[PDB]
Design a protein around this ligand. Structure first.
Ligand SMILES: Nc1ncnc2c1ncn2[C@@H]1O[C@H](COP(=O)(O)OP(=O)(O)OP(=O)(O)O)[C@@H](O)[C@H]1O
Ligand SMILES: Nc1ncnc2c1ncn2[C@@H]1O[C@H](COP(=O)(O)OP(=O)(O)OP(=O)(O)O)[C@@H](O)[C@H]1O
Ligand SMILES: Nc1ncnc2c1ncn2[C@@H]1O[C@H](COP(=O)(O)OP(=O)(O)OP(=O)(O)O)[C@@H](O)[C@H]1O
Ligand SMILES: Nc1ncnc2c1ncn2[C@@H]1O[C@H](COP(=O)(O)OP(=O)(O)OP(=O)(O)O)[C@@H](O)[C@H]1O
Ligand SMILES: [Mg+2]
Ligand SMILES: [Mg+2]
Ligand SMILES: [Zn+2]
Ligand SMILES: [Zn+2]
Ligand SMILES: [Zn+2]
Lengths: 393, 394, 386, 393, 70, 78
């Protein structure tokens, strides 16, 4: 019974302790997954309402109506949400363009984004979430990057107060730095000053808990990421999370762990190919952020297989290796899946996956989260509220 | 019309122009200096209402008039503000313990501090001021350093908008990297991060224009500050001023100019010892900001000497070497002297200083201010209104 | 129920769960701490038997009996498990000069030293131990530091195979690279290169798991160490700078801090050290004898022992013995004197220090599964009658 | 009379002041500009007698006439000095091949290049000149770079002492480190060491006032410059000037102002592209030295336009932004025109340029010059004799 | 040989002036008496002597007043 | 590269230093400090290629004799 992830999970009927050790079914477990207290660690604010009804619930709430960019017709590929072929990384980002930097440069639209994203998290029974936003991308002449960030924190804090304590998703903000750094260096340290300042203005509720180092994928940005002083952010308590991904550079992942002191690696899909890096990423406690739907639509993986293979999703191999893996959503709108759908899609990507393994990902996520001693004492008290199975056999 | 700093002093009557070249009279010219549109560059906000009737008025404005610390009795040296013998900076910095860290943590006391200070700036006819504040010292559990800073800016911004354009003193903010109390890399990283964010939150009115690198005296405070990357400060447009008082350390001034890229030197009273450093300061146009009363009280100088001596005030020596010298007040309350008084003391401190030297120091200050093109155009328009003399009869 | 660190403490009768939350008895619980499966993370090989009778046993079975330097004179301070006053560190080092570099720079003696130390670990019911050695300190003109290290590993490896698997104490080596503030810097280079080479040589049984740092309390010297999967632990004893623990965590990439008794001074270091999982190695007897702490106080003051404060803050605190012979106290004794130093320490906290050590050990996946299973069999209480 | 650059312009009658604010006429103002006390801050010694009669005058005074290189065929592009199309830097550099480090290696020819150049400076009524030379390029087996530098300084000093004080141009020397790509980084060390030695040797008359980083237009010598430790040249009182490379890079300029402590920038024609860099350059007081003819022939700009544009000469944009802009001649021989000719071209390159703008540029040059307190007090006394207009209406 | 002596927090201009003088004199004279190297009476500064090595000047370290192999 | 090897790697031998004569200062430093230049004739010919069976010393000729005449310690290897 010691193999169980949660201490409260041991004191169950013996039948359920055998059900949890049985492979998860992606069709009949939609109700059990839909009630699990979940943790979200890789969520982008810009890619939430990128098309559909949500894209018009935000545009109808704009402060000024006549300034919104006209809705362009971005054709979602066929087979979507599950494309028959990968669409690449560049096409994946371009899919969500009716939101982000063009729709949320408005007090009204940005408030519909924060408020609509919180209800979606509550609809998925998420107990903790680190939302990744770029305030510097949304700043107009009158709206400073601090004004934008100060409103995002206040909108989420307002949502967290109107809900009861037991149905309350605790939202924390990660500040991402990407895109513009390829043409300047002032922005890389202009964005690290917000985090240091934002990490001190607020001490309770919604807080800026870390700095998200997007742009670690490119090579010139990586030149400026190690050409920047990161000790000031380390002293102030901010944690560092990095985007790995298409660039399959083992040397890049090595520098982040030991030069930037990164505590989480995003989209580390090619980590098993280096056996020496896997151990270091497994003994030091580094948490890997995996996104099932967002990786199938950008890289492609075999679905509905029978036995493990050479191009299988690395979720199973990481768990055996001891790596602390976590399943996330990446882009709730640019993709079409909630945190429940992603957890269910890891039964057609990873053959033989156990239901208890789905619970371990929410225990690893509950330890990788950049929360304090108070936030992480109410998160574990909510993961112990896992619902009893509906079938049991 | 050969060597005239202000260009409005060219259609100047020859009788008055010759009067401009005569030595300044400390007692008679008090009325003329009082009407001069001056520039302030070294003014510590927390040393304004240190004692006297001004200290009390900051204390009935307290939002919570029960947590106010008691009034500690801090006697002044006899003969203040002109002490018989210099008291040193350690004793000097303790005279203003009734205001500062204790007090100014109440939101009401800070608002009175900012508004009362602005009133004293209009009384001296100051056209541009750069107040040095440390928001990290007035912060509490419910008041972060950013909240304190945003309150200080909005108190000065309101006062600016309530004044006519022709009689308005434009106030800017400098963030001070504190003395030996500072030096921790977790504290100098917070001070610079706040300055970078505040340098961009505001683009009109009262603004944050630079960081004051106090504690340069401490040898342990150095090399924690040379170990921090000041490049992001320079990229965002923040100017660096170094508070180089209370020693002759020639190898520290050399590194501030060329490593920290500092643009102003505070209390550089030993520049004449190193002629090589004096040429670099004069040629590169680094402004040396001198504080007459604060220097006389802290370290002492001869007064009313007939001829220039070895220990004489270096104000005229700096001017002869083409150094952009500026005269400031340092601490309005602790020193117990206004900007007008500081200019008049130069006659006693520096023998034979002409009335054109005083006007030159104000032109030097206008060039050394951390002001953008919009504020410079307004400051230059105010410096062209030189008051007409009254005693041009000898 | 979701507060015990092992999913086996929960499924007990109600009274046992109630006896754990009571303060640990430093007398009655002697028979129960002795039966606990402990984990040792701060043990020095050069201080096992520095005087007494075990000095003779190591001295008896040398291989060059005409070389053994004569026994010097070591006055133990008054009583000494527990000194009346601190003796300092530099004095504390010289309390064990009858054993170490001199005696162990002889093939026969070094066999006894590793053979006897493993004997002590078994008697204490230790399921895991990371021993610290300095092979370059035992080298001669015909016994290179590699030869010394290879002998040490096989002596521990031989003992492990001679003991049954149920009672086996898995031992791993931890090379100590000490910063000579006056001495030559080559021995820093030799030790690091020796650990980088030993990392790949052995993959089963006794292994060289990491490098220890007695000094710098060196950033560029440790980049190669991190490539080969070696974990660095930094001594943080004498001196009281925060900037040393601040550059050990983020420049040397340290994963364990030894004798860090002044973390509470800084309020940001405690959060960082308690949010990244950095473990603090504490030695009750060694810290008491070196620096001195109030004992038997009925309340927690300003100078009290920081174990309970660290535990409240979430810092992963382990309890160790540092030097066995020099301190003259076993792991159970160190685990019992903590009650005297820390008033109100519950007996579940003592169980907490062992779980934290299990997560702090430099063992691999296979090593951890044997260590975790062995910790599952927690001994049932004996004196539960009140 | 509150923004007049020169204090002596306030005493003018209030009828010429109206003329002073009118746009510069490049045809009717030839006589007025020719009598203006001018300042030359960018003038290469090796590109003066590159062709024409001046080349043969220099070639005729050689001490070793048998060693004179043959006069090669250098065809100037058609339409010179106003090329029909830009000819580029590399082609522009090769126009001055009949003069340079071929004739100047002869001690006799060096006198002609140094004494004829001074005679061309008095024709333009220049009150202060900063000639930049590379003594290491004219060295021989029996003539070290220090020997060449002594002759250059003493040839200009002799001419300076044979001219009246109210008619004498004060010539100062700048040493150029011309970026040998990798093969010779000892040339940079040799160049900087020569400047430091000469910075203390002479304290009166002609002096070595600074070092010219003409090699900043590269990528490996820019890296060589950025690791050269310019600290010693800063302690001996030497100023630093940097050639803003033809490559449109902003990261180089940011390091020239804050890492090399440069006090001037040469051909900084792309400062407006970064609005944050133009603000720092305008506030710190860095002087941008612009050559109209050298820029119109190398890069090419629209001429005689009736209004501004997206490709117009950046003189007006820099002046409006509060930047210290100076007009120079660069290579006075290769460009085939004088300082007076360059000033009148701004009426064609920059439409609407006023006659008070050219006066401002001379005031900017007088403040950007690397002169001491003695040479500056004599330069201002010469700039106060502004010639009275000959038209007035 | 030109001696570039580090001072106890004294002057730093002479350590650079002597190095520049040595670099110039190494190329100035090629017969008879010559400047053949620089003497370092301090640091016993690694970024201050790259120009010395790039020109072929030999350096001799003038150790003293200490017993340190470092 | 030959500069950083000598003065930053503290090299005592240089392998395949066929372009030493391009920098007279570097050649003089190598000769004076006694740094040995190890040359491989067949490997250099097969990789770089040099004229063969000439009668005089050309610009592209193999740099052995030039290095020996300059006082450099040259070694021939396989
Ligand atoms: N897979 C990825 N790889 C690299 N960068 C990514 C990736 N996914 C998101 N980003 C970065 O995340 C940043 C934040 O995206 P977000 O969804 O919050 O909207 P946004 O900033 O408005 O987007 P955009 O930059 O596309 O207009 C974007 O700048 C994008 O550069
Ligand atoms: N060297 C200095 N460093 C920092 N602040 C200074 C200094 N000299 C004067 N001050 C004033 O101190 C203010 C912040 O510090 P604080 O008000 O606590 O003063 P203090 O000198 O530390 O002591 P006190 O509060 O007793 O006056 C600054 O805004 C400035 O007004
Ligand atoms: N508790 C400690 N604190 C600091 N340094 C220590 C400590 N214990 C040992 N060292 C250092 O580690 C080395 C000794 O390690 P070890 O105890 O394994 O061998 P030893 O037999 O005691 O050696 P030696 O006789 O050379 O001291 C020496 O550098 C000693 O300074
Ligand atoms: N416009 C320019 N941009 C960049 N570098 C330049 C420019 N003009 C000249 N230089 C550099 O200045 C160096 C010295 O120029 P100068 O005219 O004084 O010498 P020179 O005798 O003409 O030299 P050379 O024969 O090598 O061209 C030239 O070698 C060239 O490297
Ligand atoms: Mg010992
Ligand atoms: Mg030429
Ligand atoms: Zn992300
Ligand atoms: Zn001050
Ligand atoms: Zn040039």
């Amino acid at each position: 019974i010691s193999e169980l992830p949660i201490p409260a999970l041991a004191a169950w009927p013996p039948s359920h302790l055998r059900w949890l050790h049985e492979p998860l079914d992606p069709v009949q477990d939609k109700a059990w997954v839909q009630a699990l207290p979940k943790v979200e660690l890789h969520c982008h604010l810009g890619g939430f309402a990128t098309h559909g009804e949500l894209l018009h619930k935000v545009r109808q709430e704009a402060a000024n109506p006549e300034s919104l960019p006209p809705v362009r017709a971005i054709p979602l590929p066929p087979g979507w949400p599950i494309p028959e072929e990968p669409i690449g990384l560049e096409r994946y980002m371009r899919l969500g363009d009716n939101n982000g930097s063009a729709l949320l440069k408005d007090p009204g639209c940005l408030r519909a984004q924060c408020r609509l994203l919180y209800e979606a998290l509550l609809a998925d029974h998420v107990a903790y979430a680190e939302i990744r936003c770029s305030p510097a991308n949304y700043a107009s002449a009158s709206r400073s990057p601090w004004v934008v960030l100060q409103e995002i924190r206040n909108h989420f804090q307002q949502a967290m107060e109107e809900t009861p304590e037991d149905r309350r998703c605790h939202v924390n903000l990660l500040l991402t730095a990407t895109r513009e750094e390829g043409g300047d260096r002032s922005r890389i340290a202009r964005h690290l000053a917000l985090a240091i300042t934002a990490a001190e203005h607020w001490k309770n509720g919604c807080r800026v808990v870390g700095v998200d180092l997007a742009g670690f994928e490119d090579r010139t940005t990586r030149a400026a990421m190690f050409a920047t002083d990161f000790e000031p952010v380390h002293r102030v308590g901010l944690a560092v999370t990095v985007h790995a991904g298409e660039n399959d550079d083992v040397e890049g992942i090595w520098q982040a762990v030991f030069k930037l002191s990164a505590r989480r690696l995003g989209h580390a899909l090619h980590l098993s190919r280096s056996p020496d890096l896997l151990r270091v990423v497994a003994e030091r406690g580094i948490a890997v952020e995996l996104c099932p739907y967002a990786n199938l639509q950008i890289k492609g993986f075999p679905l509905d297989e029978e036995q493990e293979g050479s191009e299988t999703y690395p979720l199973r191999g990481y768990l055996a290796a001891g790596v602390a893996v976590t399943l996330n959503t990446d882009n709730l709108g640019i993709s079409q899946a909630s945190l429940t759908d992603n957890l269910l899609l890891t039964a057609r990507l990873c053959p033989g996956i156990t239901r208890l393994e789905v619970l371990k990902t929410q225990v690893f996520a509950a330890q990788a989260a950049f929360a304090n001693q108070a936030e992480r004492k109410a998160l574990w008290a909510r993961l112990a509220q896992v619902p009893v199975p509906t079938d049991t056999e």
